[PDB]
Design a protein around this ligand. Structure first.
Ligand SMILES: O=C(O)CCC(=O)C(=O)O
Ligand SMILES: [Fe+2]
Length: 199
């Protein structure tokens, strides 16, 4: 059970093929790279962005930047398929006003994980985050306000869209090591799109 979170399973099933074609298109301008945390450690999850702003690691910490620090060019524009799905998802969740300007694209190879963290780099915490899962299934784990808070698990499969609004927006969360397997559309990985209001 989650407060403020609206889970729309298999919502992105029909849009899925075009989203993957558009992830590949975004990836040809801003390649997938495994970002280095401020402490000097490379993340197992490969990331890239699209939209006006993009989430990235820096020496001083985490920030949103209109420039890709690797290519030194701006991030690719948010694809229309991305805009359309997020809009329909947010409207179905009770957020018709949500206008994202950043989309963090995560690629999970077999065994890739994402340790517990909070999404607190956005200016307005009242605004939700629309998450779209594609490819192989992954176990999403969420806690509470603190670190040693009781963890709950959720499987996020292909096409699943979760809108993290209300209280769930500030919860500690992460992804457990991706189980090896096969998916017809992504072959051996999982993709996750997190639409954010970063400006
Ligand atoms: O992959 C997921 O479903 C979660 C991604 C996430 O929380 C993030 O990148 O900040
Ligand atoms: Fe996150």
């Amino acid at each position: 059970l989650a407060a403020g979170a609206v889970i729309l399973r298999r919502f992105a099933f029909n849009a899925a093929e075009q989203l993957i074609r558009d992830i590949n298109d975004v990836a040809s301008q801003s390649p997938f790279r495994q970002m280095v945390t401020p402490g000097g450690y490379t993340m197992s999850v490969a990331m890239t962005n699209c939209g006006h702003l993009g989430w990235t690691t820096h020496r001083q910490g985490y920030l949103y930047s209109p420039i890709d620090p690797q290519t030194n060019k701006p991030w690719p524009a948010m694809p229309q398929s991305f805009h359309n799905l997020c809009q329909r998802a947010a409207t179905a969740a009770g957020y018709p006003d949500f206008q994202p300007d950043a989309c963090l694209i995560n690629r999970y190879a077999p065994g890739a994980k994402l340790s517990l963290h909070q999404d607190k780099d956005e200016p307005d915490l009242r605004a939700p985050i629309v998450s779209v899962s594609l490819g192989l299934p992954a176990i999403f784990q969420f806690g509470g306000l603190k670190r040693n808070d009781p963890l709950k698990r959720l499987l996020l499969e292909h096409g699943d869209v979760v809108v993290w609004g209300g209280e769930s927006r500030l919860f500690y969360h992460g992804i457990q090591p991706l189980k090896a397997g096969f998916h017809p559309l992504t072959i051996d990985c999982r993709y996750n799109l997190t639409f954010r209001q970063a400006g």
